[PDB]
RNA sequence: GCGCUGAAGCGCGCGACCCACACCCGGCCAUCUGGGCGCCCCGAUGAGUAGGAGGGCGCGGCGGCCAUGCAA
RNA sequence: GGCGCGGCUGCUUCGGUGAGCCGUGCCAUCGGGUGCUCCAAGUGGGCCAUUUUUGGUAAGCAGAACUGGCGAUGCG
RNA sequence: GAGGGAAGCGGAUGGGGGCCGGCGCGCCCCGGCCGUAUGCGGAACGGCUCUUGCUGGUCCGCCGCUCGGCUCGGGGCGUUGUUGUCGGCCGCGCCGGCGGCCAAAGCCCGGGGGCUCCGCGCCCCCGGCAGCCGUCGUCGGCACGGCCGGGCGCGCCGAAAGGCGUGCCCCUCGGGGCACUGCGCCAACGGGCUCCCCAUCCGACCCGUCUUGAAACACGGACCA
């Protein structure tokens, strides 16, 4: 009811504004709705089909609404995630999958000789400063091109950015190891520093792509 | 639509399987279902655990009716001629070659069907005239 | 649930296309009326439709006499709708004109009406040229008449008192 | 919060219900305005028809 | 509904106290109520006339 | 039934729970409301012996149409 | 349903009256629970509970009344 | 399939084992083939007229004159099951406000009475006043689950959500409501059945009949074709 009152109270109001910008340009959007569009060769049949456009646009928006919001309930960034503990510096992993919360798959590349990947109920993960728009979903296990090294150098920059915060913040370093040990997880304290991202996120976005399609996989 | 309707008869069923009652304790007494006729009959009383009787509500969704689980509609094909109609369907329909049609005949139908782009049951059955694993 | 609503399942179901109309030509006519009925003003054609489905207890002979006194110029020679058939039974020098429409007529009735005036029309030519079905008189039964209501069985059946 | 929940449609059709659209624009009425908010006051104020 | 009660406070002054602390109840005047009804059928049709 | 006893008895109050095919809700089968183009759709009621009324499945030989058969 | 106009009639003094009839004008808390016809069925031997009974010590008695169910009704 | 310690109408219901049948699109280069418009030459047609006639076909045979495309392959590039979710329905617990009992428990202040007359203590009433109460009604705020399914856009910035046209009016603070064309229509990843056993119920056999009432210690069947 408190969110849902706000939507009402035109009706539309921005959507009454939207028309206008077309009205302002000049005289229009009956002609362009009727006159358009394409067609005419083709082969066969009914052409019952489909997609892109207009519905799809609310379904992406709609899907965006849990997505902040589930982080407001549980607090944090999103993915990409660092081993705090273990090796002082060392390397970076992305949450591709939930078997559950707690049982999680953390990821990377392998195209020639490779790199593991773990499914864990824990071992070693606390999150960083980046957000995407997935929760914690992608996977099987794929990646690869430069990227044992790149993902990893992306790790080093975050591990430097984190290591300084772990010095300023912690209770100390030894149970940041117990926090890293946990890995359900979650609520208590989240947002320290590590400023900014712009690269970190670009790197995370590629990682998501790499654990998707279409490489190395096709026959 | 169709996918959901196909799944609503096929994964639910109903497979009680309506066997005649106590068919098992006399061998001769046949499996074919007969309405439990007489008053004491527990099944007649239309109890649960008694095995359901046949009634109209039991019925499948029309959109899913007479379809193979593949969800293709089967069309019985006596010969090549039926094939023309089947070819029109292609995507919609699967062709089933009647048991009767002979081994000498079966060949022409099979090749024509492929050309028609109506591969269904017919392929399986032709490897079945050949021998085979 | 209720018992009322079960009784509500027990209303009619009057509904019938008759078991056969062996005549194909009647068989097409009887359908035509549900397309035309909700698609024009014609209540009359909608009534003829029920009465050319259901029964023989319903299908009318109308005599030229039973047209003749009963059409009598004060609904001024309209179109006379006879669901079943005309029959030939009168001599007066018969009708004052007339457009008569029916499923069937006898040949003598066909001959005598058209040589008095108008036309013996068939119901389909009526549907074509009078699709509204207004200025039209639904004339009439019977099987409802003197011989035979419940007057069946042997030697009957009677006013009644007993039977 | 019972007329909103459980109201249903009239004869001249079946029932389709007392849901949004179909009480503002649909529902018969010759007495007064048939619409939901208005009807709830008129029935419990108990006046003309 | 507030005014229907409200004259009954405004004129009256015999109603609350004596009344907590003592028995019988008062003379004077009374204000009327109305009121329409709703009916829901709780018990089924098995074994009633 | 084990079998309890400042209760797992009894009574007076009370709180929370459990529990049907009921009632709701979702999707679907008949009839009827009807509607609309041989076909589609909206909503309601809808156990069943004797039993009436109606639609359908299968048998065997006959006719006209229409095939199948060296693997029926 | 009520009124007026006009004809015809009645029973009961060459006697008193309305009523009837016809003709013509005028003025007026439910919601399909539903009518008629043809042809057919088991019947044409019940039971119980509740209420009211009458007989009988009583009875898982006998025999009525008024009703709901079982018979022919699942499911809890 | 199962077995020498656990109970039965021989099924049902759930689960495992055993057995088995099934299994495309956009673009570019090469090869291949053909082409219409117009002139020729042959021909079913049509709207219609309905004696009759006028305009309008289409494909083929195959040359001339421009100017292009297709198809089978090859090579490169780009593009059945489960789980996240948006929308609807229902459930849930917790928090908060206002009015109803003219509000009031109240406490602090102030005055009088009573009981108890052994005095404490108890009570009652009235005014100002922190205060907060149990219940009706109603409204306000959040967070979760289950089940089922897949109204929105039409210039710009803004990852995102969101705002950016203008008039009115209340408040005259933050802001609010109110008014103003047509048109179109989602993400991730890679099986059936038979018999048995255990759980659970039907369970009262079935079945049919007789009967008010059948498992029936009522009747009929060894079993089948």
Determination technique for this PDB entry?
A: cryo-EM
What is the rounded CA–CA span in Å between residue C85 and residue C113? 13
Asked whether D23 and D36 are in contact (CB, 8 A), the reply is: yes
Question: Chain D closest CA to E38's CA: distance in Å?
Answer: 11
Does B46 contact strand G, using a CB cutoff of 7 Å?
A: yes
Q: Which nucleotides of F are covered by protein (CB under 7 A)?
A: 21-23, 27-33, 35-37, 40, 42-49, 54-55, 67-72
Phi, psi of C87 (to 5 degrees): -130, 160
What is the nearest nucleotide to D46, using C1' and CA?
G29
Does B103 contact strand F, using a CB cutoff of 7 Å?
A: yes
What is the rounded CA–CA span in Å between residue A211 and residue A96? 8
What is the Cβ-side half-sphere exposure of residue A69, based on CA atoms within 13 angstroms? 11
SS3 of B74, please?
strand
CA B38 to chain CA centroid, Å, is 32
How many beta-carbon pairs under 8 angstroms link D with E? 4
DSSP one-letter string for chain A: -HHHHHHHTTTSHHHHHHHHHHHHH-S-TTHHHHH--------SS------SSTTHHHHHHHHHTTHHHHHHHH-S--S-EE-SSSSSS--EE-EEEESSSSSEEE----SSS----EEESSSS-EE-S---S-SS---SS---SSHHHHHHHHHHHHHHHHHHHHHHH-S-THHHHHHHHH-S---S---------THHHHHHHHHHHHTTSSSS---
Does B102 contact strand F, using a CB cutoff of 7 Å?
A: yes
What is the rounded CA–CA span in Å between residue D11 and residue D27? 9
Dihedral over alpha carbons A132, A135, A136, A141 (to 10 degrees) = -50
Phi, psi of B5 (to 5 degrees): -70, -40
Chain D positions touching E36 (Cβ under 8 A) are 43-44, 46
Phi, psi of B96 (to 5 degrees): -120, 120
Interface residues of E toward D, Cβ cutoff 8 Å, are 34, 36
DSSP one-letter string for C61-120: EEEHHHHHTTS-SSSTT-EEEEEEEEE----SS--SS-EEEEEE--HHHHHHHHTTSSEE
Strands A118-120 and A126-127: unpaired
CA E38 to chain CA centroid, Å, is 18
Chain E positions touching D44 (Cβ under 8 A) are 36
Return the residue of D nearest to E37 by Cα: D44
Does C8 contact strand F, using a CB cutoff of 7 Å?
A: yes
What is the nearest nucleotide to A24, using C1' and CA?
H165
- Å between E28 CA and H134 C1'? 31
Asked whether B122 and B114 are in contact (CB, 8 A), the reply is: no
For residue B75, the surrounding DSSP H or E stretch is strand B73-77
- Å between D21 CA and H167 C1'? 30
- Å between A96 CA and H25 C1'? 30
Here the contacts of B23-29 (C-beta below 8 Å, separation 24 or greater) are none
What is the rounded CA–CA span in Å between residue A108 and residue A211? 8
Residue in the block written with tokens 């009406």 = C113
Phi-psi region of C160 (alpha: psi -120 to 50; beta: other; left: phi over 0): left
SS3 of C124, please?
helix
**Both tokens of residue C99?**
């457009």
What is the rounded CA–CA span in Å between residue A217 and residue A144? 12
Dihedral over alpha carbons A120, A121, A127, A130 (to 10 degrees) = 60
What is the nearest nucleotide to B36, using C1' and CA?
H207
SS3 of B102, please?
coil
Resolution (A): 34.0
Question: Chain D closest CA to E3's CA: distance in Å?
Answer: 16
Query: Under 8 Å CB-to-CB from A148, ≥6 apart: which residues?
Result: A108, A109, A110, A114, A115
* Subunits with 3+ C-beta pairs closer than 8 A to A: none
What is the rounded CA–CA span in Å between residue B11 and residue B5? 10
Strands A104-106 and C99-104: unpaired
What is the rounded CA–CA span in Å between residue C113 and residue C94? 8
Bridge partners (DSSP) listed for residue A95: A106
Alpha-carbon distance values, E22 to E8, E17, E25, E30 (Å): 20, 8, 9, 20
Chain D positions touching E34 (Cβ under 8 A) are 46
Asked whether C86 and C64 are in contact (CB, 8 A), the reply is: yes
Bridge partners (DSSP) listed for residue A93: A81
Alpha-carbon distance values, C161 to C47, C148, C158 (Å): 36, 18, 8
What is the rounded CA–CA span in Å between residue C106 and residue C87? 6
Q: Which nucleotides of H are covered by protein (CB under 7 A)?
A: 9-13, 21-23, 79-81, 83-87, 90, 99-102, 124-126, 139-144, 149-156, 159-165, 176-190, 192-194, 201-211, 214-216, 223-225
Closest CA to C91 of C124, C116, C56: C116
Question: HEC string of B31-71?
Answer: CCCCCCCCCCCHHHHCCCCCCCCCCHHHCCCCCCCCECCCC
Does C6 contact strand F, using a CB cutoff of 7 Å?
A: yes
Question: Chain E closest CA to D46's CA: distance in Å?
Answer: 8
Closest CA to C82 of C123, C115, C43: C123
What is the rounded CA–CA span in Å between residue A152 and residue A154? 5
What is the rounded CA–CA span in Å between residue B104 and residue B84? 20
What is the rounded CA–CA span in Å between residue C138 and residue C67? 11
Asked whether C15 and C34 are in contact (CB, 8 A), the reply is: no
Alpha-carbon distance values, A151 to A82, A91, B112, C37 (Å): 11, 8, 56, 77
Closest CA to B102 of B133, B127, B126: B126
Contact D43 E36 (CB under 8 A): yes
What is the rounded CA–CA span in Å between residue B96 and residue A79? 53
For residue C24, the surrounding DSSP H or E stretch is helix C24-37
SS3 of E26, please?
coil
């Amino acid at each position: 009811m408190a969110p849902t009152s706000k939507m009402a109270l035109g009706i539309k109001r921005a959507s009454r504004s939207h028309t206008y910008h077309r009205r302002g340009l000049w005289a229009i959007k009956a002609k362009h709705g009727g006159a358009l569009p394409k067609a005419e060769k083709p082969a066969a049949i009914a052409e019952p089909k489909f997609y892109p456009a207009d519905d799809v646009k609310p379904r992406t928006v709609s899907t965006r609404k849990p997505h902040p919001t589930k982080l407001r309930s549980t607090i944090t960034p999103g993915t990409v995630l660092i081993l705090l503990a273990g090796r002082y510096m060392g390397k970076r992993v992305v949450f591709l999958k939930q078997l559950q919360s707690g049982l999680l798959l953390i990821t990377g590349p392998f195209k020639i000789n490779g790199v593991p990947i773990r499914r864990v109920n824990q071992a070693y993960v606390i999150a960083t400063s980046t957000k995407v728009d997935i929760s914690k979903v992608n996977v099987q296990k794929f990646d690869d091109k430069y990227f044992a090294r790149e993902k990893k150098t992306r790790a080093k920059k975050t591990e430097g950015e984190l290591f300084e915060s772990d010095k300023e913040a912690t209770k100390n370093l030894p149970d940041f190891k117990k926090d890293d040990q946990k890995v359900i997880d979650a609520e208590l304290i989240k947002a320290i520093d590590a400023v900014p991202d712009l690269k970190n996120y670009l790197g995370a976005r590629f990682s998501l792509r790499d654990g998707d399609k279409p490489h190395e996989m096709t026959f | 639509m169709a996918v959901p309707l196909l799944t609503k008869k096929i994964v639910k069923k109903r497979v009680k399987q309506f066997k005649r009652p106590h068919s098992d304790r006399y061998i001769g007494l046949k499996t074919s279902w007969r309405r439990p006729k007489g008053i004491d009959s527990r099944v007649r009383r239309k109890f649960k655990g008694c095995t359901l009787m046949p009634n109209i509500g039991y019925g499948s969704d029309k959109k899913t009716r007479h379809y193979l689980p593949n969800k293709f509609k089967k069309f019985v094909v006596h010969n090549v001629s039926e094939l023309e109609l089947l070819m029109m369907h292609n995507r919609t329909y699967c062709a089933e070659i009647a048991h009767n049609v002979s081994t000498r005949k079966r060949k022409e139908i099979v090749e024509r069907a492929a050309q028609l782009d109506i591969v269904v049951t017919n392929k399986l059955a032709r490897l079945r005239s050949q021998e085979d694993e | 649930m209720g018992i009322d609503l079960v009784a509500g399942g027990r209303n009619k179901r009057t509904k019938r296309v008759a078991p056969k109309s062996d005549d194909v030509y009647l068989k097409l006519l009887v359908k035509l009326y549900r397309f035309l009925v909700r698609r024009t003003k014609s209540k009359f054609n909608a009534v003829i439709l029920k009465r050319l489905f259901m029964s023989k207890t319903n299908r009318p002979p109308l005599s030229m006499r039973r047209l003749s006194n009963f059409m009598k110029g004060k609904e001024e020679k309209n179109i006379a709708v006879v669901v079943g058939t005309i029959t030939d039974d009168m001599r007066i020098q018969e009708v004052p004109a007339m457009k008569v429409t029916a499923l069937r007529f006898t040949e003598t009735a066909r001959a005598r009406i058209i040589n008095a005036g108008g036309e013996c029309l068939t119901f389909d030519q009526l549907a074509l040229r009078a699709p509204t079905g207004e200025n039209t008189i639904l004339l009439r039964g019977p099987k409802n008449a003197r011989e035979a209501v419940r007057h069946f069985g042997k030697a009957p059946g009677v006013p009644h008192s007993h039977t | 919060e019972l007329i909103y929940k459980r109201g249903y449609g009239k004869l001249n059709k079946q029932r389709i219900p007392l849901a949004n659209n179909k009480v503002i624009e649909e529902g018969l009425g010759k007495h007064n305005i048939i619409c939901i908010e208005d009807l709830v006051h008129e029935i419990l104020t108990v006046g003309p028809h | 509904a507030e005014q229907y009660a409200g004259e009954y406070e405004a004129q009256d002054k015999e109603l609350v106290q004596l009344k907590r602390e003592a028995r019988m109840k008062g003379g004077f005047y009374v204000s009327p109520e109305a009121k329409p009804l709703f009916v829901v059928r709780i018990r089924g049709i098995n074994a009633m006339h």
